[PDB]
Design a protein around this nucleic acid. Sequence first.
DNA 1: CCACCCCAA
DNA 2: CCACCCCAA
DNA 3: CCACCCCAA
DNA 4: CCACCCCAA
Lengths: 48, 548
Amino acid sequence: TIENSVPVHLLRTGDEFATGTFFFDCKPCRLTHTWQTNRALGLPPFLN
Amino acid sequence: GVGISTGTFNNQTEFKFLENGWVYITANSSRLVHLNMPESENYRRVVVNNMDKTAVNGNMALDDIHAEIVTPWSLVDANAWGVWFNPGDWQLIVNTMSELHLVSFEQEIFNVVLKTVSESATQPPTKVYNNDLTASLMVALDSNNTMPFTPAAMRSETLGFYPWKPTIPTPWRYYFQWDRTLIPSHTGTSGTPTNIYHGTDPDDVQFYTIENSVPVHLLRTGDEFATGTFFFDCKPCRLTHTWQTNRALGLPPFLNSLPQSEGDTNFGDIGVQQDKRRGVTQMGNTNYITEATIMRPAEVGYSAPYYSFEASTQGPFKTPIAAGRGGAQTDENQAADGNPRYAFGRQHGQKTTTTGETPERFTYIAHQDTGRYPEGDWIQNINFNLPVTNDNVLLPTDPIGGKTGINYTNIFNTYGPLTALNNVPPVYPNGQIWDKEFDTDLKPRLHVNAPFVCQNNCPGQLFVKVAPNLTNQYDPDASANMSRIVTYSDFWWKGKLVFKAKLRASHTWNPIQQMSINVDNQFNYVPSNIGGMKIVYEKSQLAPRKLY
DNA sequence: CCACCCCAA
DNA sequence: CCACCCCAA
DNA sequence: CCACCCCAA
DNA sequence: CCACCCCAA
């Protein structure tokens, strides 16, 4: 129940509700993709 | 310049004994490398298609199709155990020490020599060797590891393990995105299954170039190229093995009855019935508390599919495994617990006074027992109600999928958040030392090729090449590839690898398994009347330890 | 820039 | 005079 | 007067 | 004027 657990701000017309600034502590996302399997790893054979 | 020396030779193994059983192991390997002129001074892109082996509709693990690009640049790898120690040093670190730690690494190249070959077609004809004191050597360091990583240990294209023996770098090459499809097919599978070389996904086109990405240091005769000192930030390696399973964990039963005479035949009986024994089980059905039933804190090692040849966009490839032994090396499956296999020749073991093109190898079998005997398991009904009945138990012998040879063991994967594990021990000589790490957000817990896996960037590859020596005729607007002066160069390479490890104390009563010289070893560690040398493989972790 | 089979009189 | 695919630990 | 199988958190 | 199911980062 929101009424019970969380305050409610009674806004009218001349009222502004604003949050704060929420800082995030999560891991980066990479704009890169890996195209290597298990057959594209290491020192290929030597072609005689 | 060309008058004086640039470096010194040192292939010494220094043991700096510190305080608190701590030692300093600085291995130096100064080998003299030889290198010839690259065929082509041009980069190539080559496709390998052995679709003559993958048609028999039996052979699918013989897929040798890949797309590689050749570089005129000749690489130099020293990422091996055999290059840094001899059979004498190892025995020390193995018998005396407990755990080993990797520290520094610095390479140094000196006494560069470049000679031209003059072919005097006269009778024999004859060959006249000279010095082109103005010639050059092109050195390159990938200090920014911009390029792929090709550990040349995998394919025994390392450096000689005998210092008094001149060696050769490996022609550099790397993978280029090759797309394929190949469906399995047994001896019976009628018609031609499916197998093709799509080509290349335009997305995954990485065409590298050393000239462009990495500086090149043009060395002459009176120039020395030296690296720095590379500090390593990787996890320790343990010179200890765990011999504890799940049946050798905790407080054993209390034996209400003990023998009164000798013999390993006279067994001390507990003296209580299985469905009236006190303790804890992970079952809510039974009342039987057995050494197999009882609840143990976790599970040692895991059980995965064996000879489980997966596949993706590049083609099929086997499923790795990180398991010790399990079962007396008289009862293996050298497969289930994936035991490495090593093939070298003449320059990395094997009898020097040998002949032909046939490697020698060994299937290294560790000491640690986390491995399994997948021929003594079983899956039965929730009701237990044994003695279990057929229809109520799927055993190893019982086929799965209707085919004989197959099992549930073959398709089985018991890896739980309760799986305990120990990394892959060093495999000396041959074996690898340290190996870069995957650039995937999620990373493998441990590698199967190297005891050490660096956490940050690792040493940059040293690419060694010969500079083009040109004649009086050269037209850069020609279809053909000019004609250069047949030039080669030999240079001395030195290495300083630093290790820091701890000394083992005695805590049992029974001596521990050490390394020694038998009447069957002797002539495995000494030259022969002709000067026949070879380095044998020897177990790393041979000293007990407690898992719990 | 040689010391007691290593680093190191 | 090697650090995380550039300059640049 | 209990710390990571010794002395020795 | 948003921090780890309350007051209360």
